[PDB]
């Protein structure tokens, strides 16, 4: 779920929510799928 | 190695504010609304009491560790540096 | 606040008071009002009770509380949703979203027609005479103590039967005392900071503490290890 | 304002006042005017009764109340598109865009014929008798006390009655007072101050709220989660 | 503290006070209030008598001890996990997490509802008459003694019965032995300062020493070797 | 300490104050009282005697000797280990490490149940009357007399029976004969300074000196050759 | 070579705080609440002790060895190459 | 003594610091979208 995206707050923290707002919740920024599509982008090249 | 630390005095949180609840406003909006005409002011205003008690600024509880940090830090640079030197095995012959 | 707030009746500093032979005109009329214009300057709200209790609104208004002096918060008494404060203009008014509050007298102006809402309010403690209730601590004593006396040897000093100097000691004691008071009511307990401490450090920000009755806001922030 | 305005009459300041005995010929007659003066000169607008009330603008003029003092907004009733300031110099005169008004006395010139206009407007809370009714708060209350004082002292001294100590010594107290009264009525209050805060952190700002009436100037400004 | 609190009887201090012929009218009764009243003023903790005592939660409130001035902490009898001060508005309001407490008079209120919590609270050491037992410190004690003549000559200086300038020789002197006694409760000790050096040195940082009751605040962080 | 604390009788004292005819009612009585308010006020740890005792704990408890005043150390008897102080709120109360102490009057709250501690504190060289003895070292000797004077003259001048310059004289004099004792007291002989030596220059740092008795505080660290 | 020491007084913790509770609190928040308003400060406030004991900032018990350091190690690099070159063994001929 | 003096006052609001700031938010994050497609400024010229 986080290289699609989704972000579970109840895995970072403890949890004191379910509503898709920054202000309560927390924005992913998709900073591990460029690292792994160079690894399976470099299998389809071999 | 501890950061560094403000000595801090809340006479001048408003009325009727907790200072749990003053702090948790300025954390986010970065602005602290005060109180420079509280009761416990009334001596520095009207020349009762000590001018400093309503200035001077906030006092630092502060130690120049990361210059003592930087210290020992170059003092192992250049032991091993030394020592390296000492045998034949430099750097650039270990890379 | 470090020490707790046990109550002690009004003549308590009638008691100190009049020790000083200047002072023994005075009478518990006397304390009443200085008193209350005291505790009103200084303003501090542990000397205040919190109270808490529910109304009805009829049509963007509800009637308030008798001995109330100032709203901690409003919410909505199904959802739990608290009120912030009114920046409308023409709020009930229609023509040819959030909800909000507004207090101005024994009136509560809301945003909603037909709901139920609980205030958290803070009054005064009351003796079973009827009349206001005062703390014990030597510091607020005592600072009340110097407001009786200086506005005391203000008036006389108007008159001229006070020397200009007993006057300024006067209030400059009381200067002094107001800034200890101040200090001594208002810097955090070990508790308290432990509270502070918990908003203070928090490496994912918490700014929706309002919405819950400031409720989480010392809540210790923990981070899951990876 | 933290506190809240709980009404009292005027001899309320009478009872305080008199305790002097260099003031006991003031009366209510002088504790009307120098109210009046002492709430203008400090231009608290929790003081004043917020009200809305609609009129018919005739040609480029509406009749106004009785009672404004001072215009919130105004806004067509119809559209409710708040009005704005006239700069223009030739309103209502023809030779051979975005409305606006003006108010003068009991005349409103806006910039449309024949319409219907919503105004949200200011005034004093009167009592049962056609009298001006203050906040009990004691800062407000000790703060009218020292001005009377204050103003009552100046007679006197320009009289020759009063020593000028007495006089510098009640207006050092006054303004100390009249600047904790001031800050006491306008610093906000915690709700007002979530007001603020969703007015203050906007990613996307918000100018807009003076089409409405400030109604969203106080709401949270949500972000949507990608 | 370097030295030790040796308890003597009140009266100690009218030993010394009445060798001064202008203070010979000073009694037990005024020795009692001036006391406290210094206690107060100078809030040192190391006078306080440490009491740890059990209590039961009704719901959500709970019965105070009698001779409680301050709390140190708060925590449950079963788990022993410290209580943090209660920023909730709402705790025992329902409508339609981690635990805490908040103290105003002879009630707690908790966010627990049935439960026995320990409270480590302050107290004053008594004699065996139901009076206050002062440390016999000789800087504690010149500084009560300089405390209760600072008092009592102003007293007389707004009688007019003592020249301005002994008063200012008084505050003086009172004001400097303030600093020292201050000074002298507060620096620690060297078995406090291995508290605090242990503290303070800590290469993984120790922030969680609430929950326990401060018992590891002060052990040494050591460090295996590798 | 660069000198001897060679130790003589009070009335020395008394026979270098009456050699002023102003000081001529002074006793023997007077000089106690001053001697011991001097001596705590200074706090020299030179002018007190080392001891150590030995003392058994009950349960977390233990009785304390009767002339201590301050405590160097306390350590376990058996293992030699040294005690911190006690940041604990809850020490001996269950529920449903590293050792540590603490003191208030006639009584020490330690951490542990059953064992025999020892406590290197300080006390009061007496004398065969049993009386407080004070070292000969005359700038002690001169500043004690100061001090007896200064007090003595701001009595008289509170009376008025001295003029203010004489008390400015005197307050002046024992400020500086009071920097010039703790400085005498204080600044380490060659001994102690080779000791600080030794303490402070070390390539390897020593930071377990509480562990033993300060022990090798001052121990040369040396460094073998290679 | 120890480092700089802050010369610390504890005239304005607050009341009721004991010296290692109040130190553990601004070690976490890098905030010390600090009490202006004390017993022990009112001389410096109604002016009858020097009004210095509230301010000037604490003092710093500093000595420079850290170019007393510097000035032995730029020394020890000087003979090393003085040596070097007396006998004709320069840093790139044991390179 | 200041009605023939003081100098000539300025009404200065300092809005160059903050369109700047702006300015080097809009580098960074059309610079951070660039990593997270693997898609470089080199990429594009």
């Given at each position: 779920?986080?290289?699609?995206?989704?972000?579970?707050?109840?895995?970072?923290?403890?949890?004191?929510?379910?509503?898709?707002?920054?202000?309560?919740?927390?924005?992913?920024?998709?900073?591990?799928?460029?690292?792994?599509?160079?690894?399976?982008?470099?299998?389809?090249?071999? | 190695?501890?950061?560094?630390?403000?000595?801090?005095?809340?006479?001048?949180?408003?009325?009727?504010?907790?200072?749990?609840?003053?702090?948790?406003?300025?954390?986010?909006?970065?602005?602290?609304?005060?109180?420079?005409?509280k009761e416990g002011t009334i001596?520095?205003?009207?020349?009762?009491?000590?001018?400093?008690?309503?200035?001077?600024?906030?006092?630092?509880?502060?130690?120049?560790?990361?210059?003592?940090?930087?210290?020992?830090?170059?003092?192992?640079?250049?032991?091993?540096?030394?020592?390296?030197?000492?045998?034949?095995?430099?750097?650039?012959?270990?890379? | 606040?470090?020490?707790?707030?046990?109550?002690?009746?009004?003549?308590?500093?009638?008691?100190?008071?009049?020790?000083?032979?200047?002072?023994?005109?005075?009478?518990?009329?006397?304390?009443?009002?200085?008193?209350?214009?005291?505790?009103?300057a200084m303003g501090?709200?542990?000397?205040?009770?919190?109270?808490?209790?529910?109304?009805?609104?009829?049509?963007?208004?509800?009637?308030?509380?008798?001995?109330?002096?100032?709203?901690?918060?409003?919410?909505?008494?199904?959802?739990?949703?608290?009120?912030?404060?009114?920046?409308?203009?023409?709020?009930?008014?229609?023509?040819?979203?959030?909800?909000?509050?507004?207090?101005?007298?024994?009136?509560?102006?809301?945003?909603?027609?037909?709901?139920?809402?609980?205030?958290?309010?803070?009054?005064?403690?009351?003796?079973?005479?009827?009349?206001?209730?005062?703390?014990?601590?030597?510091?607020?004593?005592?600072?009340?103590?110097?407001?009786?006396?200086?506005?005391?040897?203000?008036?006389?000093?108007?008159?001229?039967?006070?020397?200009?100097?007993?006057?300024?000691?006067?209030?400059?004691?009381?200067?002094?005392?107001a800034?200890?008071c101040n200090?001594?009511?208002?810097?955090?307990?070990?508790?308290?900071?432990?509270?502070?401490?918990?908003?203070?450090?928090?490496?994912?920000?918490?700014?929706?503490?309002?919405?819950?009755?400031?409720?989480?806001?010392?809540?210790?922030?923990?981070?899951?290890?990876?």
């Amino acid at each position: 779920d986080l290289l699609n995206g989704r972000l579970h707050m109840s895995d970072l923290e403890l949890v004191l929510i379910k509503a898709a707002y920054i202000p309560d919740r927390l924005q992913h920024y998709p900073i591990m799928n460029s690292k792994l599509n160079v690894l399976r982008g470099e299998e389809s090249k071999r | 190695n501890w950061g560094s630390i403000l000595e801090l005095d809340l006479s001048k949180v408003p009325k009727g504010w907790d200072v749990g609840k003053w702090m948790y406003y300025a954390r986010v909006n970065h602005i602290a609304v005060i109180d420079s005409f509280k009761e416990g002011t009334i001596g520095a205003s009207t020349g009762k009491l000590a001018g400093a008690l309503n200035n001077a600024g906030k006092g630092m509880i502060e130690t120049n560790i990361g210059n003592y940090i930087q210290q020992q830090i170059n003092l192992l640079e250049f032991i091993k540096m030394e020592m390296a030197d000492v045998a034949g095995i430099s750097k650039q012959r270990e890379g | 606040m470090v020490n707790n707030i046990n109550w002690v009746k009004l003549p308590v500093i009638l008691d100190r008071l009049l020790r000083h032979p200047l002072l023994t005109d005075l009478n518990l009329e006397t304390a009443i009002q200085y008193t209350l214009d005291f505790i009103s300057a200084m303003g501090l709200p542990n000397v205040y009770v919190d109270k808490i209790e529910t109304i009805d609104i009829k049509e963007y208004r509800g009637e308030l509380p008798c001995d109330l002096i100032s709203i901690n918060q409003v919410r909505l008494h199904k959802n739990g949703i608290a009120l912030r404060a009114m920046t409308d203009n023409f709020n009930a008014y229609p023509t040819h979203g959030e909800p909000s509050f507004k207090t101005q007298g024994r009136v509560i102006f809301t945003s909603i027609k037909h709901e139920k809402v609980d205030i958290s309010y803070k009054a005064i403690m009351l003796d079973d005479e009827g009349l206001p209730l005062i703390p014990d601590n030597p510091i607020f004593l005592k600072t009340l103590e110097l407001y009786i006396k200086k506005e005391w040897f203000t008036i006389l000093f108007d008159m001229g039967k006070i020397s200009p100097a007993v006057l300024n000691n006067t209030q400059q004691e009381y200067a002094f005392k107001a800034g200890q008071c101040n200090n001594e009511f208002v810097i955090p307990s070990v508790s308290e900071m432990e509270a502070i401490t918990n908003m203070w450090n928090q490496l994912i920000p918490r700014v929706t503490e309002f919405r819950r009755g400031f409720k989480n806001l010392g809540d210790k922030e923990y981070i899951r290890v990876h």
